[model samples]
Target: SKKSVSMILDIEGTNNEAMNNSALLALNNAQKKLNIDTNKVESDDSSTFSNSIDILCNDNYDLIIAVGARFAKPLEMVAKKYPKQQFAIIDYEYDKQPSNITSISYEDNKSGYLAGLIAGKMT
Candidate 1:
């Protein structure tokens, strides 16, 4: 089996307006701060992901970044189904960690909270 890395963007917890609004606000702030231009911003669903995986793998991407927690399950499923494909998940946890799935996360309530406090004071 051939192995490849690719990036995966997962939509965070759905039907949770508070989390959605907070995430959107954070992203908007980031875009403004970073001078990011968006022609048309959209949310990626499971169906969209299926379509994306086909296109991305076809393009030879070896790693996929799962940008949302909602993607944890989906990415895990994909990683297992495609053991040769590597995936990265951001800000989430799994009951059974997969060797191919890498998760990068921070505890905002602890270290992240401290950083936020300092930044808030500076502002």
Candidate 2:
């Protein structure tokens, strides 16, 4: 059941473009490395792409990955609504941070560390 079905969502901005491209790149790389048929991405979206969250999660998907900072609120709502579904929301701030929601974020300083070093040298 873990591999039965999976879902990935992304907001329009707030790292959506970078996140989506990274995911696709990783997916492609993985597929090539494992030699699998991942040709059909099986991606989804709300009215923007197709169907509502309720309709998409009707069958009880094993995993849901929501990318982009803007997805936080909507993902929270969906996670609560779909009590049994597992969800990971990337880069969003929530007041309560629901039980089913897992957030993914990075420390800007980590990326900035290299830049910091470079800046220090330049300075």
Candidate 3:
């Protein structure tokens, strides 16, 4: 079966240290390898967290990803309600995440890693 994954961004992604961009990059990175359908949305206000999670859960997105620290708390609450849904958050880890939530950690050296990639691939 072809599975679908959704990317819930903190805001319009920026090149700053926030690392939201890396989450998007990882999405495309995975798409190339897995060929799974992808859906991406940028959150603007407080409600988008629950909004995005609710909408995606109802749509049966195989995985719902919320990137960056901003999503950590809200996702925890959402995951509790939607016990069957799978969720992942980038750059933040919960000490006690719901079984459905996958916490992904990005190495703090992302810029150095990016630099290394262009050193042929980075520095």
Candidate 4:
């Protein structure tokens, strides 16, 4: 039997953006592989981040994933208020991270290098 867990994925971008797609794909895969239920929200502007956070706060979720650096400010405000809530942020670094928050920062150079290698092989 699979243990059920509720999750919120808040992505910062248009619906069609790569960041949004990447987060969606990861969460979708996790749903199938990990038996975790997820709710996804995409933001067209900065204000939507706060709104999304507010919406998620109303629910009892096991984890909240925020995509992109745009969420850093809103997440900081919300994460502090909800100290018991678990949060993971992509593409953001915290100089003084909260106890309940986990930040994931990525390097663009690795992706660029892989792209160059693949293109070179195709040519």
> For each candidate, what TM-score against the reference?
0.49, 0.56, 0.77, 0.71
The candidate scoring highest on lDDT is 3
lDDT of 4 by residue, 1-123 (tens): 332233344433354367555555555555654545567665557876776786686686666777777788898998878888777776778999888777654443123432232223223
| Candidate closest to the true structure, highest TM-score | 3
Q: What is the C-alpha lDDT of each candidate?
A: 0.48, 0.48, 0.68, 0.60
TM-score of 2: 0.56
Q: What is the total number of backbone clashes in candidate 2? A: 0
Instruction: Identify the runs in model 1 with alpha carbons over 4 angstroms from their true place.
Output: 1-6, 10-42, 107-123
Per-candidate RMSD, Å: 9.1, 10.4, 6.8, 9.0
**Error at 78, model 4, angstroms:** 0.7
Say what the RMSD of model 4 is: 9.0
Instruction: Give one digit per residue, the lDDT tens place, for model 2 in 27-95.
Output: 344434342333222233543422344555665544455545555655666667778776655456567
Q: Kindly report which residue pairs in candidate 3 clash with one another.
A: 115-122, 115-123, 116-122, 116-123, 117-121, 117-122, 118-121, 118-122, 119-122
Taking the tens digit of each residue's C-alpha lDDT, what string does model 3 give over 2-113? Answer: 6787877766436433576666675666666564788888866756688677777888787787767788888888888888787877778788767988766677324344
